[PDB]
Write an enzyme that holds these catalytic residues in place. Structure first.
Site, PDB file in Angstrom:
ATOM      1  N   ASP A 195       0.819  -1.193   0.000  1.00 57.33           N
ATOM      2  CA  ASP A 195       0.000   0.000   0.000  1.00 57.33           C
ATOM      3  C   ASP A 195       0.855   1.246   0.000  1.00 57.33           C
ATOM      4  O   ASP A 195       2.086   1.160  -0.081  1.00 57.33           O
ATOM      5  CB  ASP A 195      -0.985  -0.004   1.198  1.00 57.33           C
ATOM      6  CG  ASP A 195      -0.409   0.267   2.571  1.00 57.33           C
ATOM      7  OD1 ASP A 195       0.823   0.338   2.700  1.00 57.33           O
ATOM      8  OD2 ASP A 195      -1.185   0.418   3.500  1.00 57.33           O
ATOM      9  N   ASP A 197       1.121   4.995   2.255  1.00 50.87           N
ATOM     10  CA  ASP A 197       0.749   5.721   3.463  1.00 50.87           C
ATOM     11  C   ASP A 197       1.112   7.161   3.394  1.00 50.87           C
ATOM     12  O   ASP A 197       2.185   7.488   2.933  1.00 50.87           O
ATOM     13  CB  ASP A 197       1.415   5.125   4.715  1.00 50.87           C
ATOM     14  CG  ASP A 197       1.228   3.641   4.824  1.00 50.87           C
ATOM     15  OD1 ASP A 197       0.090   3.207   4.799  1.00 50.87           O
ATOM     16  OD2 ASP A 197       2.244   2.914   4.831  1.00 50.87           O
ATOM     17  N   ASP A 276      -3.571   4.484   2.818  1.00 53.63           N
ATOM     18  CA  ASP A 276      -3.845   4.879   4.204  1.00 53.63           C
ATOM     19  C   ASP A 276      -3.529   6.352   4.391  1.00 53.63           C
ATOM     20  O   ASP A 276      -2.459   6.817   3.986  1.00 53.63           O
ATOM     21  CB  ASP A 276      -3.058   4.065   5.220  1.00 53.63           C
ATOM     22  CG  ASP A 276      -3.383   2.590   5.247  1.00 53.63           C
ATOM     23  OD1 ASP A 276      -4.514   2.218   4.859  1.00 53.63           O
ATOM     24  OD2 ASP A 276      -2.503   1.810   5.635  1.00 53.63           O
TER      25      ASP A 276
HETATM   26 MG   LIG Z   1       2.884   0.574   3.913  1.00 54.68          MG
HETATM   27 ZN   LIG Z   2      -0.615   1.406   5.139  1.00 53.14          ZN
END
Ligand SMILES: [Mg+2]
Ligand SMILES: [Zn+2]
Ligand code: NA
Length: 352
Positions: A195, A197, A276
């Site tokens: 992902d 962030d 995120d």
């Molecule tokens: Mg990450």
């Molecule tokens: Zn994350």
DNA sequence: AAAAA
């Protein structure tokens, strides 16, 4: 001398001990899935110290003076030196419960409890789970299954940068003075991640504007047809509480990233990306940056060192000195390290 | 229960 604390080591991405650490990480993972916390911790700390080495271990004599290498860890190192493989890690990789847990938890929205439920139901493949007519899925699991292939593909740096541009353009629309910082693995120098962030902060925003920002940004993305999944967790942050997920307002998203937005060397013209976002009060920006940059082992050791060596309490929100009975302020990560009496460790040196 | 550095 090599410190037992990751926050007192420089851990860069040139891991010369991958043969050992990949085996120790498998064994730690297995102890985590099997509820053995003590054993998981021991393999994690040993894998962490080996990651910090500027040379590959090629004999048992090379392990001399290295802390956190117990008798059980040294037998694993010995077996790997012997034939280049770990019989212990290989048996985990072949274990039916480990294989199912890794497979099931690779789905966004599936944790230990659901993976366990499915395994005890006799499920072994994602195909059989998805096509089952009696199972009921949470909305997070539906998104996990709908975007599976994209989410299981690594997010690369041109993709993280394309997401950063999207985040920045959305955030600036509502808070023009906002600071947006890419955190996690990408901040530590990683070429890939599961992902992307971000830490968002605003020097001028009121308590309400800072509560509303993540709602404004996600609604702006929903209108544009970019929000594939959204979960906003409200803040439980307490300005005056002692240090102990963190309590900041946050959101776990799946964004639609158009291929045209990606400036890289290279079907459907888009990719699903887990994103995120963390919103924190401006004065706590350094603590949240430190917490979100990681790695998880680096953060664990920082907090352990602060408690056991400095009688300080550190988390993603604040740093408290128990002797002086005072909260310590910081405008940067450098000031946090200085408060702790630690030599500054650069983000790309925190890959513990 | 799961999402997390
Ligand atoms: Mg990450
Ligand atoms: Zn994350
Ligand atoms: Na999962």
């Amino acid at each position: 001398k090599i410190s037992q604390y990751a926050c007192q080591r420089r851990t860069t991405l040139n891991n010369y001990n991958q043969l050992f650490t990949d085996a120790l990480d498998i064994l730690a993972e297995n102890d985590e899935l099997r509820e053995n916390e003590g054993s998981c911790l021991a393999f994690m700390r040993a894998s962490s110290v080996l990651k910090s080495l500027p040379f590959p271990i090629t004999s048992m004599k090379d392990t001399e003076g290295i802390p956190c290498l117990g008798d059980k860890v040294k037998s694993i190192i010995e077996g790997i030196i012997e034939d280049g493989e770990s019989s212990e890690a290989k048996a985990v990789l072949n274990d039916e419960r480990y294989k199912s847990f890794k497979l099931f938890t690779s789905v966004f929205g599936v944790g230990l409890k659901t993976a366990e439920k499915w395994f005890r139901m006799g499920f072994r493949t994602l195909s059989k789970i998805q096509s089952d007519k009696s199972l009921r899925f949470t909305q997070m699991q539906k998104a996990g299954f709908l975007y599976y292939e994209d989410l299981v593909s690594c997010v690369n740096r041109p993709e993280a940068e394309a997401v950063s541009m999207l985040v920045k353009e959305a955030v600036v629309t509502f808070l023009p003075d906002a600071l947006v910082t890419m955190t996690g693995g990408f901040r530590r120098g990683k070429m890939t991640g599961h992902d992307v962030d971000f830490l968002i902060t605003s020097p001028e925003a009121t308590e309400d504007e800072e509560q509303q920002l993540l709602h404004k940004v996600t609604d702006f993305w929903k209108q544009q047809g970019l929000l594939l999944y959204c979960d906003i967790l409200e803040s439980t942050f307490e300005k005056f509480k002692q240090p102990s997920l963190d309590h900041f307002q946050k959101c776990f998203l799946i964004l639609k990233l158009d291929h045209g937005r990606v400036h890289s060397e290279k079907g459907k013209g888009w990719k699903a990306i887990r994103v995120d976002l963390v919103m924190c009060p401006y004065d706590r920006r350094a603590f949240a940056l430190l917490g979100w940059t990681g790695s998880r082992q680096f953060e664990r050791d920082l907090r352990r060192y602060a408690t056991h060596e400095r009688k300080m309490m550190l988390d993603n929100h604040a740093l408290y000195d128990r002797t002086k009975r005072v909260f310590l302020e910081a405008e940067s990560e450098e000031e946090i390290f200085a408060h702790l009496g630690l030599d500054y460790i650069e983000p790309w040196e925190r890959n513990a």
